[PDB]
From a paper:
Despite marginal differences in the crystallization conditions used for the preparation of the complexes, polymorphism can be observed, as demonstrated by three different space groups: P212121 for CtFDO:PESB, CtFDO:4NC, CtFDO:4NP and CtFDO:ABTS, P21212 for CtFDO:MAMB and P21 for CtFDO:IPEA and CtFDO:free. The position of the active-site water WAS (HOHA836) is similar to that in CtFDO:free (shifted by 0.7 Å). MAMB is hydrogen-bonded to Tyr476 and, via WAS, to flavin. One additional water mediates the contact of MAMB with Asn562. MAMB is further stabilized by van der Waals (vdW) interactions with the flavin, Ala133, Leu399, Tyr476 and Asn562.
The FAD-dependent oxidoreductase from Chaetomium thermophilum (CtFDO) is a novel thermostable glycoprotein from the glucose–methanol–choline (GMC) oxidoreductase superfamily. The structure of CtFDO reveals an unusually wide-open solvent-accessible active-site pocket with a unique His–Ser amino-acid pair putatively involved in enzyme catalysis. A series of six crystal structures of CtFDO complexes revealed five different subsites for the binding of aryl moieties inside the active-site pocket and conformational flexibility of the interacting amino acids when adapting to a particular ligand.
Residue numbers in the entry: 46 to 630
Write the structure that this text describes.
C-alpha cells in the first residue's frame, strides 16, 4: 500500500503526483482511465491536431431544453495527461477577480495574490524571436511569467497574413492591444500563449512535463487503462479505492493509502466516484440503494462549460495562404510539413484550424449601449429561476452567491465574459466564458462502467442568450471593420447580413451553439457546506477525512479564460497544502 492514491492522471493528478514524489519517502499511485499516448503526430505536432484519438467514448447529453432539445456528443479526455494531451494548447490565466471571487464565497487564502506565485512556479515561458514579436505585435510582462517551472509555453513561430487584417479590424471596433493577457486582465486582442516546447515545436502536455520528466523516480507509480470504481472507508476515513480495467473485464482490486485519497477525474468523472462511494445527494443515493456516507447535495450539481459558436463566412478576396490552404492545397500542406520536419518553421507550429491572435471582452466592451439593461434583467430575476424546482436550498444559496459575484463581474470593465477568434479561414469562433446557466451530472446506476446522465442545461437561464447575442454582434463589427472589408467577408447560411434583430440572430444560435468546449467544471464546488459546497478551502470533501478534490470539479465557477493554466497552478497549490499538513520535503 502507498502514501497517496490519485484517481485520474490528467492535468491535476499528474501535477500533484510529481510534487508529492519530490519527497522520496512519499509513494504515489496514479490510476488513469486512459492509456499512454504513443507520441503520434496528432498529439505532438500542432498542425496535425487530432483531439479525437483520446475522447471518452459513449458519452451523450440529455435533450438540451435551452437549445431546441438538441442531443450533443460529450467531449472529455481519456488518456494519461487528460485534456492537456488533446486540447488546443490555449494557455491563459483567469482575471484577478476570478480568484478574489472564490475567496469571497468563503474560501480563506484564495485571491489573485495567493494564486500568482503558483502560476509562476507552474511554468517556463520561452520568448518568441524579436523579428516575430515586432512583426506580430507579441507583447508580454516577463516579470509575471515563470522561467523555472515544468510546463513549457511560447507562441508559434509563424502567423497567417490575414491575422493582421483581423487584429487591425478588432483594434478598429474597440478591442485594443493587451500588454499581457496573463497579468489578470485581457480587455482586447493578444497572441494566444500556446503550451508548446520551443526546443521541439511539440505539445507540452502533463504526461511529458509532470510524468516523463520525473518518471525515473521509483516512488511515482502509474497504472494506465484502469478506473477508480469506488472509495474504500474505515468509518469516515478514506483508506483506499477499488479499481477495474477500463475495457470492462470482470475484475475488481482494492489498493490502500497511508495518508490520503485525491480525486482528479475531472468535472464528469469526480462526481461519479463520490456518488458511487455514497458521497452525494441523499435522494439520488436512496433511489439507487447506495449507503449514504456524506449527504452532500452539491455533488453533481453546478456543472458549467464555456459554450462555443462557429460562424461560417465566404470571402470574395481572402489572402493566401490561410489555415484553410492546409486542407484544400495538398502542395501548400506538403511544403509546410516538409518545412516543419526540416527547420521546425511555419504553419505546423500553430494548432490546426486556429490563428495566433484572439480577443476577450467585458460585458460593457461587448455592449457599451445596453450592458446596464442586461445587468438589470439579471439583478431582477431570482437566482432560484435558473435551477429546477425542488433544487436543494443549500445548492440554491450557493448559486445565488455565484450569481451575485458574476453580476459584479458584469459591471467590471476588467473582467471578460466572451472570446472572439478567427482561424483566417471559412469560420470564426465566439466563446461564452461566464454563463449563469447551471447543469447536472448524476450516475444512472451503481454499475461503474455506466455513463452518468450529463445535462449541460445550456441557455436555460435567458440572461445567457442576451450576453451571447452581444458577443455575436461585436464579432460582426470586426468582420464589417475597414481592415477586414478588403478581404470581402460575408456571413454564410444559416447566419447572414439579412439577420438584424436579437430574435432572428439568437434563433439561429439556439440551433448552432455547442454546450461545451470540454471545459466541464464546478461539479464538486469549493464553497461552504451550507451554500451547497462539496469541499472546504483546503479542498477536503465534507464529513470524511483523508479525501480531497484536485481537478477543476472544485472550481465555484468558469474563469475569464480557458481552464488549463489554472488546472496546473491550482494543483501546484494543493500540493503545498498537503505537504504542509503531513510534513514532507
Ligand atoms: C478537445 C479539448 C480541447 C480543449 C480542452 C479540453 C478538451 C477535451 N480544454 C479543457 C482543459 O484541457 C480541461 O478543462 C483540463 O484538462 C481539466 O483538468 P482536470 O485535471 O480537471 O481534468 P482532465 O480531463 O485533465 O483529467 C481527468 C482524467 O481523469 C480520468 N478519469 C476519469 N474518470 C476516472 C476514473 N474513474 N478513474 C480514473 N481516471 C479517471 C480521465 O481519463 C482524464 O484523463 C482546454 N483548456 C485550455 O485551457 N485550452 C484549450 O485549448 C483547451 N481545449
Ligand atoms: C522547458 O522547461 C524546462 C524548465 O525550465 C527547461 O529545462 C531547463 O533548461 C536549461 C537549459 O536547457 C537546463 O540547463 C536546466 O537544467 C533545465 N531544467 C530546469 C531549470 O528545471 C527547458 O529549457 C524548457 N524548454 C525551453 C524551450 O526553454
Ligand atoms: C422540448 O421537449 C419538451 C418535452 O419534454 C417540450 O416541452 C418542448 O416543447 C420541446 N421544445 C422544443 C422547442 O422542441
Ligand atoms: C501590428 O500593429 C501595427 C500597429 O501598431 C499594425 O501596423 C500592424 O498591421 C499589426 N500587425 C499585426 C500582425 O498584428
Ligand atoms: C464475475 O466473476 C464473479 C465470480 O467469478 C461473479 O460473481 C460475477 O457474476 C462475474 N460477473 C460477470 C459480469 O461476469
Ligand atoms: C497552393 O500552394 C502552393 C505552395 O505554396 C502555391 O504555390 C500555389 O500558388 C497554391 N495554389 C492555390 C490554387 O492556392
Ligand atoms: C481558440 O480555439 C480553442 O480554444 C479551441 C479550438 C478547437 C478545439 C477543438 N474542438 C478546442 C478549443
Ligand atoms: Mg530568443
Ligand atoms: Na523563426
Amino acid at each position: 500500500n502507498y502514501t497517496f492514491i490519485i484517481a485520474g492522471g490528467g492535468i491535476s493528478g499528474l501535477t500533484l503526483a510529481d510534487r508529492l514524489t519530490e519527497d522520496p519517502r512519499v509513494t504515489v499511485l496514479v490510476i488513469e482511465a486512459g492509456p499512454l499516448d504513443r507520441g503520434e503526430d496528432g498529439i505532438l505536432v500542432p498542425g496535425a491536431f487530432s483531439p479525437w484519438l483520446y475522447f471518452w467514448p459513449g458519452l451523450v447529453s440529455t435533450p438540451q431544453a435551452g437549445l431546441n432539445n438538441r442531443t450533443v456528443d460529450v467531449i472529455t479526455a481519456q488518456v494519461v495527461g487528460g485534456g492537456s494531451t488533446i486540447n488546443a494548447m490555449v494557455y491563459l490565466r483567469g482575471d484577478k477577480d476570478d480568484y478574489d471571487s472564490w475567496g469571497a464565497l468563503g474560501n480563506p487564502g484564495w485571491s489573485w495574490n495567493s494564486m500568482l506565485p503558483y502560476f509562476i512556479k507552474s511554468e517556463t515561458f520561452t520568448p518568441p524571436s524579436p523579428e516575430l514579436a515586432a512583426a506580430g505585435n507579441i507583447t508580454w510582462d516577463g516579470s509575471i511569467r515563470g522561467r523555472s517551472g515544468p510546463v513549457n509555453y511560447s507562441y508559434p513561430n509563424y502567423f497567417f497574413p490575414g491575422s493582421e487584417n483581423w487584429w487591425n479590424a478588432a483594434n478598429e471596433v474597440g478591442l485594443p492591444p493587451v500588454k499581457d493577457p496573463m497579468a489578470g486582465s485581457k480587455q482586447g486582442v493578444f497572441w494566444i500563449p500556446s503550451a508548446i516546447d520551443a526546443r521541439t515545436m511539440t505539445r507540452s502536455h502533463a504526461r511529458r512535463n509532470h510524468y516523463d520528466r520525473v518518471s525515473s523516480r521509483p516512488n511515482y507509480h502509474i497504472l494506465p487503462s484502469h478506473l477508480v470504481s469506488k472509495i474504500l472507508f474505515r468509518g469516515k476515513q478514506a483508506i483506499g479505492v477499488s479499481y477495474i480495467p477500463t475495457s470492462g473485464g470482470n475484475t475488481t482490486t482494492n489498493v490502500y493509502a497511508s495518508k490520503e485519497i485525491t480525486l482528479a477525474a475531472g468535472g464528469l468523472g469526480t462526481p461519479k466516484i463520490l456518488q458511487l462511494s455514497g458521497i452525494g445527494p441523499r435522494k439520488l443515493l436512496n433511489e439507487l440503494g447506495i449507503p449514504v456516507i456524506s449527504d452532500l447535495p452539491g455533488v453533481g450539481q453546478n456543472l458549467q462549460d464555456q459554450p462555443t459558436l462557429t460562424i461560417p463566412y465566404t470571402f470574395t478576396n481572402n489572402v493566401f495562404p490561410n489555415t484553410d490552404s492546409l486542407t484544400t492545397n495538398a502542395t501548400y500542406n506538403a511544403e509546410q510539413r516538409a518545412l516543419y520536419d526540416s527547420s521546425k518553421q511555419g504553419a505546423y507550429t500553430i494548432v490546426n484550424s486556429l490563428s495566433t491572435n484572439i480577443g476577450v471582452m467585458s460585458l460593457q466592451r461587448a455592449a457599451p449601449k445596453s450592458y446596464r439593461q442586461i445587468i438589470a434583467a439579471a439583478r431582477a430575476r431570482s437566482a432560484s429561476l435558473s435551477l429546477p424546482p425542488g433544487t436543494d436550498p443549500a445548492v440554491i444559496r450557493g448559486y445565488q452567491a455565484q450569481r451575485n459575484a458574476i453580476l459584479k463581474q458584469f459591471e467590471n470593465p476588467n473582467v471578460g465574459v466572451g472570446t472572439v477568434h478567427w482561424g483566417t479561414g471559412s469560420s470564426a469562433l465566439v466563446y461564452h466564458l461566464k454563463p449563469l446557466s447551471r447543469g447536472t451530472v448524476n450516475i444512472r446506476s451503481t454499475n461503474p462502467l455506466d455513463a452518468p446522465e450529463i445535462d449541460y442545461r445550456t441557455g436555460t437561464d435567458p440572461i445567457d442568450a442576451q450576453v451571447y447575442t452581444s458577443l455575436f454582434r461585436k464579432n460582426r463589427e470586426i468582420f464589417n471593420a475597414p481592415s477586414m472589408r478588403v478581404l470581402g467577408p460575408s456571413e454564410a447560411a444559416p447566419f447572414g447580413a439579412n439577420l438584424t434583430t436579437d430574435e432572428e440572430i439568437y434563433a439561429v444560435m439556439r440551433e448552432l451553439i455547442n454546450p461545451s468546449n470540454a471545459h466541464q467544471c464546478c461539479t464538486a464546488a469549493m464553497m461552504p457546506k451550507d451554500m451547497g459546497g462539496v469541499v472546504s478551502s483546503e479542498q477536503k470533501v465534507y464529513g470524511v477525512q483523508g479525501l480531497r478534490v484536485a481537478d477543476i470539479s472544485f472550481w465555484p465557477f468558469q474563469l475569464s479564460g480557458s481552464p488549463m493554466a489554472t488546472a496546473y497552478a491550482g494543483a501546484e497549490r494543493l500540493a503545498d497544502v498537503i505537504k504542509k499538513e503531513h510534513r514532507l520535503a
